[PDB]
Amino acid sequence: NNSTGTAALAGKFQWGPAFQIKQVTNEVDLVNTFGQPTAETADYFMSAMNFLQYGNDLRVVRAVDRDTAKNSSPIAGNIEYTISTPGSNYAVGDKITVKYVSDDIETEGKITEVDADGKIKKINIPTAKIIAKAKEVGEYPTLGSNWTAEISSSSSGLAAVITLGKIITDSGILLAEIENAEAAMTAVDFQANLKKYGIPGVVALYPGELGDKIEIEIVSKADYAKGASALLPIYPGGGTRASTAKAVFGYGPQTDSQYAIIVRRNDAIVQSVVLSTKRGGKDIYDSNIYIDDFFAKGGSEYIFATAQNWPEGFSGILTLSGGLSSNAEVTAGDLMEAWDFFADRESVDVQLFIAGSCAGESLETASTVQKHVVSIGDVRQDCLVLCSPPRETVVGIPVTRAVDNLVNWRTAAGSYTDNNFNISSTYAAIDGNYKYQYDKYNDVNRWVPLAADIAGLCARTDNVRGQILNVIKLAIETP
């Protein structure tokens, strides 16, 4: 395609997919997918963006901390609670009351599952009011000490003991690759709470606080006819809200195990589908609409779900929260794990390697990541690993000091003996100052690794050096 200028980029982004070789072609198409540049993301958004200027195709891989990244979920609003002593002779809509020091805060809780003897098996306490009061008095999400829960005064039956913990802030789920896809959606620990708080397994598709803006609306074949009147409840916040299902769908839920799903971000009805919890079942087109499969195959850009522990006849409003992409602490290695996704010609045909994108990171990682990226093009020898200097070394100081630094770094010598870049590949193209662009998003002038740019400048000229596009200043010039 002029010799198939396929770039390759890996780094931290505001939005997943995490650890996936998702391909990108437009700017407005990468924003859609990994979108705005945060002050922790900048140099990677730019890296891509100002490449797609000379760019046909870009293959990226988002680096997430696997240990602390989180996909927004419906678990992450609820409130710890443990039925210390199941009562007896209780029933199902017996109301529960959460007090703050003998003072009523929430009074809309309610037992929701008993057995034959009235032994309390499951309850549901809305946290809208309490997290409010709790935030308001420093006890968030700690809680516990002055926070108490009693039953109606009273339900038919007696003896019970509910014990309150903290406000759960761990969404309890992270989706990365798809080999693990619903396998994380089906972890004892996760699936556990989906039972405990009687909700379905519906989570945001990509790690990130950006997922908190999603709001699923679920209606079953049951409350679908009453679709207008049916007053869907809101988990975990509380309160209700008139359904909308029949007022958005023509083709309504067919079988009793089919549900209407309406996904919203910012009041926008981002997606609208009908799915089934029973394998095989299809729409009027023999399209397998069994939940687990539908999503298993790029079914939805926004969310991801699993029929497992999906409450029968469940209808309500799910509120995703606790969503948490942490670039906060993506370790250098967490980057190298990512880059590795390209280290075999068997798998990915990628011609160029945007590497300078780490220019800004911890000087150490600035060097050791790239250094390693070179050792991927080296061992594969179907590419160009192009690489740029660390901001530290080139942007602040005057040229006098500037060059001294660069040359020391390229060997060992003075200050950068340790974090050197002392390698020598015929595939290694290093990258020689650092560019000063304007950031149409944050609306600020910003220094970015120049390598990202020249790489697109290659996909161009011949097959894979002529002024660069959007520069407005270079660290050194020229002369």
mmCIF file of all heavy atoms in Angstrom, residues 57-83:
data_model
loop_
_atom_site.group_PDB
_atom_site.id
_atom_site.type_symbol
_atom_site.label_atom_id
_atom_site.label_comp_id
_atom_site.label_asym_id
_atom_site.label_seq_id
_atom_site.Cartn_x
_atom_site.Cartn_y
_atom_site.Cartn_z
ATOM 1 N N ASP A 57 -2.910 2.636 8.444
ATOM 2 C CA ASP A 57 -3.324 1.764 9.535
ATOM 3 C C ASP A 57 -2.350 1.797 10.716
ATOM 4 O O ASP A 57 -1.134 1.870 10.540
ATOM 5 C CB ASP A 57 -3.549 0.323 9.041
ATOM 6 C CG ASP A 57 -2.305 -0.550 9.154
ATOM 7 O OD1 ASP A 57 -1.180 -0.014 9.094
ATOM 8 O OD2 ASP A 57 -2.459 -1.784 9.291
ATOM 9 N N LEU A 58 -2.908 1.755 11.921
ATOM 10 C CA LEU A 58 -2.130 1.746 13.142
ATOM 11 C C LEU A 58 -2.658 0.631 14.018
ATOM 12 O O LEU A 58 -3.859 0.515 14.227
ATOM 13 C CB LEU A 58 -2.276 3.083 13.867
ATOM 14 C CG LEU A 58 -1.530 3.235 15.195
ATOM 15 C CD1 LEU A 58 -0.094 3.664 14.949
ATOM 16 C CD2 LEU A 58 -2.226 4.240 16.097
ATOM 17 N N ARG A 59 -1.772 -0.207 14.520
ATOM 18 C CA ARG A 59 -2.200 -1.245 15.429
ATOM 19 C C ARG A 59 -1.732 -0.846 16.817
ATOM 20 O O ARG A 59 -0.539 -0.590 17.011
ATOM 21 C CB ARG A 59 -1.579 -2.576 15.033
ATOM 22 C CG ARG A 59 -1.559 -2.826 13.533
ATOM 23 C CD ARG A 59 -2.878 -3.387 13.036
ATOM 24 N NE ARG A 59 -2.793 -3.832 11.646
ATOM 25 C CZ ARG A 59 -2.254 -4.984 11.261
ATOM 26 N NH1 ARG A 59 -1.739 -5.813 12.161
ATOM 27 N NH2 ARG A 59 -2.223 -5.306 9.976
ATOM 28 N N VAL A 60 -2.656 -0.783 17.779
ATOM 29 C CA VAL A 60 -2.312 -0.369 19.143
ATOM 30 C C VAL A 60 -2.609 -1.439 20.180
ATOM 31 O O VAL A 60 -3.340 -2.385 19.921
ATOM 32 C CB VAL A 60 -3.038 0.921 19.549
ATOM 33 C CG1 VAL A 60 -3.237 1.815 18.336
ATOM 34 C CG2 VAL A 60 -4.369 0.594 20.184
ATOM 35 N N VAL A 61 -2.023 -1.276 21.356
ATOM 36 C CA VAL A 61 -2.281 -2.162 22.482
ATOM 37 C C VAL A 61 -2.247 -1.336 23.761
ATOM 38 O O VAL A 61 -1.206 -0.787 24.126
ATOM 39 C CB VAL A 61 -1.221 -3.271 22.574
ATOM 40 C CG1 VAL A 61 -1.380 -4.058 23.860
ATOM 41 C CG2 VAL A 61 -1.314 -4.191 21.380
ATOM 42 N N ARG A 62 -3.382 -1.238 24.443
ATOM 43 C CA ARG A 62 -3.443 -0.416 25.644
ATOM 44 C C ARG A 62 -2.780 -1.098 26.830
ATOM 45 O O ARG A 62 -3.094 -2.241 27.152
ATOM 46 C CB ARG A 62 -4.887 -0.074 26.002
ATOM 47 C CG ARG A 62 -5.001 0.870 27.197
ATOM 48 C CD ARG A 62 -6.356 0.766 27.864
ATOM 49 N NE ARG A 62 -6.727 1.996 28.553
ATOM 50 C CZ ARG A 62 -7.728 2.081 29.420
ATOM 51 N NH1 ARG A 62 -8.441 1.003 29.710
ATOM 52 N NH2 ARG A 62 -8.008 3.238 30.001
ATOM 53 N N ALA A 63 -1.868 -0.390 27.486
ATOM 54 C CA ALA A 63 -1.249 -0.902 28.698
ATOM 55 C C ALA A 63 -2.083 -0.525 29.916
ATOM 56 O O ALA A 63 -2.275 0.651 30.214
ATOM 57 C CB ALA A 63 0.167 -0.381 28.839
ATOM 58 N N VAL A 64 -2.583 -1.541 30.605
ATOM 59 C CA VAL A 64 -3.341 -1.363 31.831
ATOM 60 C C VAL A 64 -2.536 -1.978 32.959
ATOM 61 O O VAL A 64 -1.698 -2.835 32.704
ATOM 62 C CB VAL A 64 -4.693 -2.081 31.729
ATOM 63 C CG1 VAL A 64 -4.926 -2.979 32.939
ATOM 64 C CG2 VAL A 64 -5.821 -1.074 31.538
ATOM 65 N N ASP A 65 -2.760 -1.555 34.198
ATOM 66 C CA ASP A 65 -2.094 -2.232 35.305
ATOM 67 C C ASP A 65 -3.145 -3.313 35.394
ATOM 68 O O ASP A 65 -4.329 -3.015 35.403
ATOM 69 C CB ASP A 65 -1.800 -1.299 36.474
ATOM 70 C CG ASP A 65 -1.216 -2.041 37.667
ATOM 71 O OD1 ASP A 65 0.009 -2.322 37.677
ATOM 72 O OD2 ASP A 65 -1.993 -2.346 38.595
ATOM 73 N N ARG A 66 -2.707 -4.564 35.473
ATOM 74 C CA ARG A 66 -3.602 -5.724 35.472
ATOM 75 C C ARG A 66 -4.038 -5.869 36.933
ATOM 76 O O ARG A 66 -5.076 -6.463 37.221
ATOM 77 C CB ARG A 66 -2.852 -6.987 35.046
ATOM 78 C CG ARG A 66 -3.251 -7.529 33.693
ATOM 79 C CD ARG A 66 -2.127 -8.355 33.084
ATOM 80 N NE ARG A 66 -2.636 -9.608 32.532
ATOM 81 C CZ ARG A 66 -3.246 -9.720 31.355
ATOM 82 N NH1 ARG A 66 -3.425 -8.652 30.590
ATOM 83 N NH2 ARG A 66 -3.681 -10.907 30.946
ATOM 84 N N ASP A 67 -3.236 -5.340 37.846
ATOM 85 C CA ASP A 67 -3.469 -5.529 39.269
ATOM 86 C C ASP A 67 -4.473 -4.534 39.844
ATOM 87 O O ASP A 67 -5.054 -4.777 40.899
ATOM 88 C CB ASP A 67 -2.148 -5.433 40.044
ATOM 89 C CG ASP A 67 -1.176 -6.547 39.691
ATOM 90 O OD1 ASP A 67 -1.569 -7.729 39.792
ATOM 91 O OD2 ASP A 67 -0.016 -6.235 39.322
ATOM 92 N N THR A 68 -4.674 -3.409 39.170
ATOM 93 C CA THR A 68 -5.527 -2.375 39.737
ATOM 94 C C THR A 68 -6.406 -1.654 38.729
ATOM 95 O O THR A 68 -6.987 -0.623 39.042
ATOM 96 C CB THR A 68 -4.708 -1.325 40.491
ATOM 97 O OG1 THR A 68 -3.833 -0.662 39.575
ATOM 98 C CG2 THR A 68 -3.897 -1.978 41.596
ATOM 99 N N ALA A 69 -6.503 -2.177 37.519
ATOM 100 C CA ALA A 69 -7.406 -1.582 36.560
ATOM 101 C C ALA A 69 -8.766 -2.155 36.868
ATOM 102 O O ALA A 69 -8.859 -3.264 37.389
ATOM 103 C CB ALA A 69 -7.002 -1.929 35.172
ATOM 104 N N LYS A 70 -9.815 -1.402 36.548
ATOM 105 C CA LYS A 70 -11.183 -1.826 36.818
ATOM 106 C C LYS A 70 -12.165 -1.392 35.725
ATOM 107 O O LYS A 70 -12.118 -0.257 35.252
ATOM 108 C CB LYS A 70 -11.639 -1.306 38.185
ATOM 109 C CG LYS A 70 -10.890 -1.925 39.364
ATOM 110 C CD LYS A 70 -11.043 -3.433 39.363
ATOM 111 C CE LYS A 70 -10.067 -4.095 40.307
ATOM 112 N NZ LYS A 70 -10.154 -5.578 40.202
ATOM 113 N N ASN A 71 -13.035 -2.316 35.321
ATOM 114 C CA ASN A 71 -14.158 -2.017 34.443
ATOM 115 C C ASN A 71 -15.336 -1.621 35.300
ATOM 116 O O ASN A 71 -15.695 -2.355 36.212
ATOM 117 C CB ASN A 71 -14.564 -3.265 33.673
ATOM 118 C CG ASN A 71 -13.583 -3.635 32.602
ATOM 119 O OD1 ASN A 71 -12.699 -4.457 32.819
ATOM 120 N ND2 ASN A 71 -13.730 -3.033 31.430
ATOM 121 N N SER A 72 -15.950 -0.478 35.027
ATOM 122 C CA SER A 72 -17.122 -0.089 35.794
ATOM 123 C C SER A 72 -18.095 -1.263 35.859
ATOM 124 O O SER A 72 -18.190 -2.042 34.914
ATOM 125 C CB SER A 72 -17.789 1.117 35.152
ATOM 126 O OG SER A 72 -16.816 1.993 34.632
ATOM 127 N N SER A 73 -18.813 -1.395 36.973
ATOM 128 C CA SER A 73 -19.734 -2.520 37.159
ATOM 129 C C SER A 73 -20.910 -2.182 38.080
ATOM 130 O O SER A 73 -20.928 -1.130 38.715
ATOM 131 C CB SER A 73 -18.980 -3.737 37.699
ATOM 132 O OG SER A 73 -18.746 -3.607 39.088
ATOM 133 N N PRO A 74 -21.901 -3.083 38.157
ATOM 134 C CA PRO A 74 -23.092 -2.819 38.963
ATOM 135 C C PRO A 74 -22.864 -3.205 40.412
ATOM 136 O O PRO A 74 -23.673 -2.862 41.269
ATOM 137 C CB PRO A 74 -24.153 -3.752 38.354
ATOM 138 C CG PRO A 74 -23.495 -4.446 37.201
ATOM 139 C CD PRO A 74 -22.021 -4.353 37.432
ATOM 140 N N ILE A 75 -21.788 -3.933 40.681
ATOM 141 C CA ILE A 75 -21.453 -4.293 42.052
ATOM 142 C C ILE A 75 -21.009 -3.068 42.837
ATOM 143 O O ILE A 75 -21.310 -2.931 44.019
ATOM 144 C CB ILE A 75 -20.322 -5.340 42.106
ATOM 145 C CG1 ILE A 75 -20.893 -6.758 42.112
ATOM 146 C CG2 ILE A 75 -19.473 -5.144 43.348
ATOM 147 C CD1 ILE A 75 -20.885 -7.425 40.773
ATOM 148 N N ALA A 76 -20.318 -2.166 42.154
ATOM 149 C CA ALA A 76 -19.484 -1.174 42.816
ATOM 150 C C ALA A 76 -20.228 0.012 43.419
ATOM 151 O O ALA A 76 -19.658 1.090 43.561
ATOM 152 C CB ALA A 76 -18.400 -0.687 41.867
ATOM 153 N N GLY A 77 -21.483 -0.178 43.793
ATOM 154 C CA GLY A 77 -22.174 0.845 44.563
ATOM 155 C C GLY A 77 -22.738 0.300 45.865
ATOM 156 O O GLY A 77 -22.890 1.014 46.858
ATOM 157 N N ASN A 78 -23.051 -0.987 45.838
ATOM 158 C CA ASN A 78 -23.661 -1.659 46.958
ATOM 159 C C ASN A 78 -22.911 -1.430 48.244
ATOM 160 O O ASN A 78 -21.976 -0.639 48.290
ATOM 161 C CB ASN A 78 -23.749 -3.145 46.664
ATOM 162 C CG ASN A 78 -24.823 -3.456 45.677
ATOM 163 O OD1 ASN A 78 -25.952 -2.998 45.830
ATOM 164 N ND2 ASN A 78 -24.492 -4.223 44.648
ATOM 165 N N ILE A 79 -23.327 -2.143 49.284
ATOM 166 C CA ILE A 79 -22.781 -1.977 50.623
ATOM 167 C C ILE A 79 -22.542 -3.331 51.278
ATOM 168 O O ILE A 79 -23.452 -4.149 51.361
ATOM 169 C CB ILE A 79 -23.746 -1.174 51.498
ATOM 170 C CG1 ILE A 79 -23.373 -1.321 52.975
ATOM 171 C CG2 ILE A 79 -25.176 -1.629 51.251
ATOM 172 C CD1 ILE A 79 -24.110 -0.373 53.912
ATOM 173 N N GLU A 80 -21.316 -3.570 51.727
ATOM 174 C CA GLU A 80 -20.996 -4.785 52.460
ATOM 175 C C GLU A 80 -22.144 -5.128 53.394
ATOM 176 O O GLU A 80 -22.738 -4.241 54.000
ATOM 177 C CB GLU A 80 -19.744 -4.569 53.307
ATOM 178 C CG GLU A 80 -18.509 -4.122 52.551
ATOM 179 C CD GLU A 80 -17.690 -5.283 52.060
ATOM 180 O OE1 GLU A 80 -18.229 -6.085 51.264
ATOM 181 O OE2 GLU A 80 -16.513 -5.393 52.472
ATOM 182 N N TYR A 81 -22.461 -6.409 53.512
ATOM 183 C CA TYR A 81 -23.427 -6.844 54.511
ATOM 184 C C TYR A 81 -23.415 -8.351 54.643
ATOM 185 O O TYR A 81 -23.272 -9.067 53.656
ATOM 186 C CB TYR A 81 -24.835 -6.360 54.174
ATOM 187 C CG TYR A 81 -25.580 -7.227 53.181
ATOM 188 C CD1 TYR A 81 -26.194 -8.405 53.580
ATOM 189 C CD2 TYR A 81 -25.677 -6.860 51.847
ATOM 190 C CE1 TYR A 81 -26.874 -9.194 52.675
ATOM 191 C CE2 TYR A 81 -26.360 -7.641 50.938
ATOM 192 C CZ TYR A 81 -26.953 -8.806 51.356
ATOM 193 O OH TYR A 81 -27.630 -9.585 50.451
ATOM 194 N N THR A 82 -23.579 -8.833 55.865
ATOM 195 C CA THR A 82 -23.509 -10.261 56.121
ATOM 196 C C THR A 82 -24.612 -10.666 57.087
ATOM 197 O O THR A 82 -24.659 -10.190 58.219
ATOM 198 C CB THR A 82 -22.148 -10.639 56.722
ATOM 199 O OG1 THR A 82 -21.169 -9.662 56.341
ATOM 200 C CG2 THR A 82 -21.715 -12.021 56.245
ATOM 201 N N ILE A 83 -25.506 -11.538 56.639
ATOM 202 C CA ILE A 83 -26.599 -11.998 57.483
ATOM 203 C C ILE A 83 -26.068 -12.872 58.615
ATOM 204 O O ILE A 83 -26.103 -14.101 58.539
ATOM 205 C CB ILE A 83 -27.652 -12.753 56.656
ATOM 206 C CG1 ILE A 83 -28.259 -11.819 55.606
ATOM 207 C CG2 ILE A 83 -28.744 -13.315 57.551
ATOM 208 C CD1 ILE A 83 -29.349 -12.457 54.789
#
